[PDB]
Amino acid sequence: MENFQKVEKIGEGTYGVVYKARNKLTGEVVALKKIRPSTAIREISLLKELNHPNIVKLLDVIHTENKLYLVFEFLHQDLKKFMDASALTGIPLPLIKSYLFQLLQGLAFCHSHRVLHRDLKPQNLLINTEGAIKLADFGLARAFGVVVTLWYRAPEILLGCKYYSTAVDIWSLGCIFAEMVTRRALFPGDSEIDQLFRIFRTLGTPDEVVWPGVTSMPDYKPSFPKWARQDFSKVVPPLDEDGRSLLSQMLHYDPNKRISAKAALAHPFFQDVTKPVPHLRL
């Protein structure tokens, strides 16, 4: 657009490319997502009225010249870069806790407004110098669709569920939480089946006992290997028991048993939550 001065390309999203840009008139620095039905456009204009401190603000939606532009407030850095930058020493547990707590607040808010993210990953979790972290790049689905990171995909999606719930976001956030703690992706699959099987190898191959209805799912095969569940002490060793307890509830196979964001916020793990300042190199 002539209204914006693309400063730098900051990412290759899914629906499009994201640029750091400057508003020629106001001088405001923003994140501009460029894409490329009209009903989903409504679904979008709705995300605009989603105001919460832990959700990246969508400032403007501009549809023109066979292109859709989404203008977002600009955040300082993404969690993937911060995790990479913190790999030698690891993110301090208090900051990990603060970030998880805030993200749960953002999801509790989104979910209470019937909005699902669908594709949470470190790359779309944005942080600022003040210690805040915000959800960004919400996935629409049910519209534009019908390489890609599968590491944070909930099992029900991998098994072909056609209608996933708010539980898919809790699963993704649980995988992210584990990763912040161990400094290694929890389930780094390189294909849908490898992803699914890495989850099975760690949490055990689900069955009707722990996940009623799982054997009747679209992509479930009786021929799936039967792996036994591993202990969380080995899964996320540096995490204390309150953290492991919470993580296990965020990673329950059954979407209906999986803890909600609201309930998670009341977990004992957050009893001593604080809001530390991250050391950010910009």
Ligand SMILES: Nc1nc(Nc2ccccc2)sc1C(=O)c1ccccc1
């Ligand atoms: N607001 C915002 N700030 C961003 N800032 C930023 C700063 C430094 C490095 C990378 C991203 S990204 C970003 C996004 O809304 C976003 C859009 C699509 C995919 C992922 C993120």
